[PDB]
Motif scaffolding. Structure first.
Motif, PDB file in Angstrom:
ATOM      1  N   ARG A  79      -0.754   6.381   1.243  1.00 20.93           N
ATOM      2  CA  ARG A  79      -1.218   5.224   0.251  1.00 20.93           C
ATOM      3  C   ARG A  79      -0.631   3.857   0.849  1.00 20.93           C
ATOM      4  O   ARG A  79       0.223   3.676   1.249  1.00 20.93           O
ATOM      5  CB  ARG A  79      -0.836   5.633  -1.143  1.00 20.93           C
ATOM      6  N   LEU A 133      -0.919  -0.547  -0.624  1.00 18.91           N
ATOM      7  CA  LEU A 133      -0.960  -1.370  -1.777  1.00 18.91           C
ATOM      8  C   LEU A 133      -1.356  -2.708  -1.150  1.00 18.91           C
ATOM      9  O   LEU A 133      -0.645  -3.312  -0.194  1.00 18.91           O
ATOM     10  CB  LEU A 133       0.452  -1.511  -2.464  1.00 18.91           C
ATOM     11  N   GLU A 141       5.861   7.543 -11.451  1.00 19.74           N
ATOM     12  CA  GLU A 141       6.312   6.063 -11.780  1.00 19.74           C
ATOM     13  C   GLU A 141       5.882   5.265 -12.892  1.00 19.74           C
ATOM     14  O   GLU A 141       4.746   5.044 -12.966  1.00 19.74           O
ATOM     15  CB  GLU A 141       6.390   5.274 -10.243  1.00 19.74           C
ATOM     16  N   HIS A 171      -1.828   1.606 -15.711  1.00 18.65           N
ATOM     17  CA  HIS A 171      -1.893   0.154 -14.860  1.00 18.65           C
ATOM     18  C   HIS A 171      -2.994   0.126 -14.504  1.00 18.65           C
ATOM     19  O   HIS A 171      -3.576  -1.139 -13.733  1.00 18.65           O
ATOM     20  CB  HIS A 171      -0.826   0.357 -13.738  1.00 18.65           C
TER      21      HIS A 171
HETATM   22  C1  LIG Z   1       2.248   2.240  -0.770  1.00 16.57           C
HETATM   23  C2  LIG Z   1       2.230   3.385  -1.874  1.00 16.57           C
HETATM   24  O1  LIG Z   1       3.628   3.233  -2.551  1.00 16.57           O
HETATM   25  C3  LIG Z   1       3.358   2.664  -3.770  1.00 16.57           C
HETATM   26  O2  LIG Z   1       2.283   1.976  -3.922  1.00 16.57           O
HETATM   27  C4  LIG Z   1       4.420   2.565  -4.857  1.00 16.57           C
HETATM   28  N1  LIG Z   1       4.554   1.256  -5.500  1.00 16.57           N
HETATM   29  C5  LIG Z   1       3.863   0.855  -6.545  1.00 16.57           C
HETATM   30  C6  LIG Z   1       3.981  -0.346  -6.877  1.00 16.57           C
HETATM   31  C7  LIG Z   1       3.366  -1.135  -8.032  1.00 16.57           C
HETATM   32  N2  LIG Z   1       4.026  -2.556  -8.102  1.00 16.57           N
HETATM   33  C8  LIG Z   1       3.641  -3.383  -8.990  1.00 16.57           C
HETATM   34  N3  LIG Z   1       2.845  -2.851  -9.982  1.00 16.57           N
HETATM   35  C9  LIG Z   1       2.077  -1.732  -9.886  1.00 16.57           C
HETATM   36  N4  LIG Z   1       0.926  -1.420 -10.661  1.00 16.57           N
HETATM   37  C10 LIG Z   1       2.387  -0.759  -8.822  1.00 16.57           C
HETATM   38  C11 LIG Z   1       1.743   0.675  -8.834  1.00 16.57           C
HETATM   39  N5  LIG Z   1       1.321   1.559  -8.583  1.00 16.57           N
HETATM   40  C12 LIG Z   1       5.167  -0.653  -5.886  1.00 16.57           C
HETATM   41  N6  LIG Z   1       5.315   0.403  -5.074  1.00 16.57           N
END
Ligand SMILES: CCOC(=O)Cn1cc(-c2ncnc(N)c2C#N)cn1
Length: 295
Positions: free
Chosen positions: A17, A19, A200, A69
Motif C-alpha cells: 500500500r 499513502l 490500526e 477514517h
Molecule cells: C503505506 C501503508 O502504511 C500505512 O498507511 C499505515 N499508516 C496509516 C497512516 C495514517 N496516518 C494518518 N491518518 C490516517 N487516516 C492513516 C491511515 N490509514 C499512517 N501510516
C-alpha cells in the motif's frame, strides 16, 4: 476532471500500500496489486487485487458501526483516475502505535507463543490447544512494529498501557474484540472464517478513537474456507494457497529455506488468485465486483 496522483505528496510506502497527502487534513490511501507471500513481495502482481481489497474494506467499514477514517465516497473527485477503485480519501488521524490484533483461532505467532510458553500476549490459555484451535472468547493479542526487516513483536496488555494510556488501552482491547466478533460472525454465516485480524486506530481532533488503515482484507486477516475447517492441521489460505503451493512446489525452482527472493508467478496462478479474491468479496459482501468502480 480528477487530479493526477503526481499532484499529491507521497508520504508513506508499505509492502503493498501507499499513502499520499491530499491536504492538511486528508490523505489518499492506495492499494496496489502487489501480493506478499513468505514475507516477500512477489514479482508478479495480481490483477485487480487492489480494487478488490479496497471494495472489501469499504464493505466492512459500512458493516461496522464504529467511527472510521473514510472521508468520502469511492468515487470522490479527489481520487485520481489512475487509482480509481483502489484508493480511498481518508481523514488524517494521530495514529496510535499499536497493532490491534484479534485472534478467534490459534495459528501463526499466537500458536508459536503458546507452544513456547503456554501464553499469548499475557493470556494464559488452557492446555491441549493446537494448530487452528478455536479460541473462545477471541483474544486481544497486540503487537508493535519492529525494524524494516523483522516481523511485528507480540506484546502484552501492560505494553499497550505503556504505549497509549490505561483507559485508552482498555478501549483498544474492547473495540478490537467487539468489531472482530461482529465481522467474524458475518463472514462465517457466508461460509468464510476470519481466523484473526489486525487493526490500526488513530485519534481525531476531539480525542475520539477512529478505525483506520484497512479492515478485514485477506492481507489484514486470515481468510479460511469454513466448509473445510479442520482443527489440528494448517488451514489453507483462502486467497493465497495457489501462490503458496506453486512457490513451494516442483515447478518454481525455488527453495523457501534459501531466503533468496522467489521467482515470478505463472500468469494462470495470478489469474486463479484474482478469482479467489473476487469469490471472497462477493460471498462476504453479497455484492458483485463487476459493479465496483475502476478506471
Ligand atoms: C503505506 C501503508 O502504511 C500505512 O498507511 C499505515 N499508516 C496509516 C497512516 C495514517 N496516518 C494518518 N491518518 C490516517 N487516516 C492513516 C491511515 N490509514 C499512517 N501510516
Amino acid at each position: 476532471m480528477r487530479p493526477s496522483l503526481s499532484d499529491y505528496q507521497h508520504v508513506a510506502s508499505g509492502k503493498v500500500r501507499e499513502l499520499y497527502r491530499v491536504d492538511d487534513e486528508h490523505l489518499l490511501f492506495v492499494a496496489t496489486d502487489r501480493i506478499s507471500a513468505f514475507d516477500f513481495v512477489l514479482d508478479t502482481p495480481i490483477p485487480d487485487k487492489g480494487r478488490i481489497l479496497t471494495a472489501m474494506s469499504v464493505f466492512f467499514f459500512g458493516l461496522l458501526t464504529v467511527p472510521n477514517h473514510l472521508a468520502g465516497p469511492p468515487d470522490d473527485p479527489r481520487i485520481p483516475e489512475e487509482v480509481l477503485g483502489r484508493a480511498l480519501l481518508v481523514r488524517r488521524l494521530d495514529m496510535l502505535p499499536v497493532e490491534c490484533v484479534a485472534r478467534g483461532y490459534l495459528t501463526g505467532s499466537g500458536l508459536l507463543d503458546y507452544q513456547r510458553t503456554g501464553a499469548v500476549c499475557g493470556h494464559v490459555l488452557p492446555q491441549g490447544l493446537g494448530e487452528a484451535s478455536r479460541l473462545d472468547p477471541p483474544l486481544f493479542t497486540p503487537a508493535t512494529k519492529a525494524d524494516i526487516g523483522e516481523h511485528d513483536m507480540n506484546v502484552d496488555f501492560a505494553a499497550v498501557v505503556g504505549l497509549v494510556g490505561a483507559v485508552r488501552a482498555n478501549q483498544l482491547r474492547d473495540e478490537t474484540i467487539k468489531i472482530y466478533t461482529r465481522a467474524a460472525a458475518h463472514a462465517l454465516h457466508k461460509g468464510i472464517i476470519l481466523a484473526d485480524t489486525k487493526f490500526e486506530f488513530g485519534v481525531d481532533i476531539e480525542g475520539n478513537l477512529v478505525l483506520a488503515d484497512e479492515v478485514f482484507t485477506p492481507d489484514s486477516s486470515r481468510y479460511w474456507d469454513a466448509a473445510h475447517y479442520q482443527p489440528g492441521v494448517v488451514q489453507d489460505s483462502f486467497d493465497k494457497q495457489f501462490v503458496r503451493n506453486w512457490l513451494t512446489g516442483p515447478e518454481s525452482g525455488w527453495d523457501r529455506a534459501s531466503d533468496t527472493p522467489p521467482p515470478p508467478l505463472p500468469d494462470e496462478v495470478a489469474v486463479a488468485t484474482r478469482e479467489r479474491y473476487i469469490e471472497a468479496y462477493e460471498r462476504i459482501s453479497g455484492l458483485s465486483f463487476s459493479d465496483w468502480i475502476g478506471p
